[PDB]
Amino acid sequence: SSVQTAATSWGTVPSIAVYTANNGKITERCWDGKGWYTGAFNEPGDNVSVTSWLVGSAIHIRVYASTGTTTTEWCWDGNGWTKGAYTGDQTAATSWGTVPSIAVYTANNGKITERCWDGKGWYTGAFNEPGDNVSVTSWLVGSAIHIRVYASTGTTTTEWCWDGNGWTKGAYTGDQTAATSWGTVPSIAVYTANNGKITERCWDGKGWYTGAFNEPGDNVSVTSWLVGSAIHIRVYASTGTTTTEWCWDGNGWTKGAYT
Ligand SMILES: CCN(CC)c1ccc2c(c1)Oc1cc(N(CC)CC)ccc1C2c1ccccc1C(=O)OCCOCCn1cc(CO[C@@H]2O[C@@H](C)[C@@H](O)[C@@H](O)[C@@H]2O)nn1
Ligand SMILES: CCN(CC)c1ccc2c(c1)Oc1cc(N(CC)CC)ccc1C2c1ccccc1C(=O)OCCOCCn1cc(CO[C@@H]2O[C@@H](C)[C@@H](O)[C@@H](O)[C@@H]2O)nn1
Ligand SMILES: CCN(CC)c1ccc2c(c1)Oc1cc(N(CC)CC)ccc1C2c1ccccc1C(=O)OCCOCCn1cc(CO[C@@H]2O[C@@H](C)[C@@H](O)[C@@H](O)[C@@H]2O)nn1
Hints:
Elements: E1 4-10, E2 15-22, E3 25-31, E4 36-38, E5 43-44, E6 47-55, E7 58-67, E8 70-76, E9 81-83, E10 90-96, E11 101-108, E12 111-117, E13 122-130, E14 133-141, E15 144-153, E16 156-162, E17 167-169, E18 176-182, E19 187-194, E20 197-203, E21 208-216, E22 219-227, E23 230-239, E24 242-248, E25 253-255
Antiparallel strand pairs: 1-2, 2-3, 3-4, 3-5, 6-7, 7-8, 8-9, 10-11, 11-12, 12-13, 14-15, 15-16, 16-17, 18-19, 19-20, 20-21, 22-23, 23-24, 24-25
């Protein structure tokens, strides 16, 4: 019943792009510092995930649009939207490096599996674990990636950790999740939409706890960015066809201009 969203951000402006799947069509809204507007992206799909990276100041966007079991990758490289080489379900994606490496996690029929890009083609990764819902975040430590995948069946969410030596279960404690991370520590915020309500758990480096965020919504996507050492987070909560943007900028959650 709800609409499904995915969101990505970049820069110290920042620019934001929000992709919304509604009745089988994905559309896009965009922020460049002074107001929202309708973006150029428009392609069919029932669920959506997104990641993006910068090479210098040039943004590259990848939108993963799922229908049935088929996911179609869409590519922004500064020159229109074009179909990617990637080959119902629900996806989560993350990327790192200037290469880039991509990893796309697909919840299909209760199992989550992984497809990876490393510059020379798509291949099936080692991640294979139960779940009805997936979200993902990652960070670099210099040049080594660390990945956390949040896998949900029922109301139970299991964190999976990749840290250079195989997957292991993390200590984090079908609902729908979204995740973001920042720093080298790192900090993590995970948001969960369950029975019409979105709540938040957070990692310091030292134990999980419940965050302050609590708003209605059957579907959540998030994005975040750093200005110096201050984190700025945007959470997009959807009920029916309405999406509200809540904003963390260091002092409580303010209502955003998103429409
Ligand atoms: C920093 C500047 N950038 C980055 C934007 C750049 C650099 C080099 C090229 C660039 C662009 O573009 C091309 C384009 C072509 N064409 C255009 C008609 C023919 C295909 C030819 C050479 C260059 C080349 C190129 C020139 C000389 C020698 C080699 C290449 C090359 O690697 O080649 C790059 C393309 O082919 C080989 C490597 N590659 C890159 C990709 C990108 O794939 C997409 O992006 C990935 C991240 C995934 O999402 C994937 O699923 C998706 O399809 N696929 N294959
Ligand atoms: C006091 C300031 N802090 C801040 C956390 C701190 C810093 C370093 C350590 C600290 C604590 O504790 C230990 C403890 C040990 N022991 C004795 C108790 C061995 C059993 C040994 C070395 C240090 C180390 C340590 C010492 C020297 C060199 C490295 C480390 C280290 O790797 O530190 C790594 C950071 O550990 C902090 C606590 N932590 C981190 C995690 C990682 O958790 C995973 O990853 C997270 C991102 C989440 O996804 C989480 O859900 C998931 O399970 N689990 N516990
Ligand atoms: C948080 C406290 N408030 C109340 C609105 C506030 C906020 C911003 C300013 C404020 C005061 O004062 C100034 C003053 C100056 N001057 C003149 C004296 C020079 C020193 C210059 C800038 C600011 C700005 C300013 C800073 C950054 C971006 C825009 C503005 C602005 O002028 O716009 C006012 C904010 O609302 C108008 C529209 N808007 C909103 C945003 C940020 O909003 C959020 O953040 C975005 C990233 C998106 O997520 C968006 O959907 C979400 O609503 N940026 N523009």
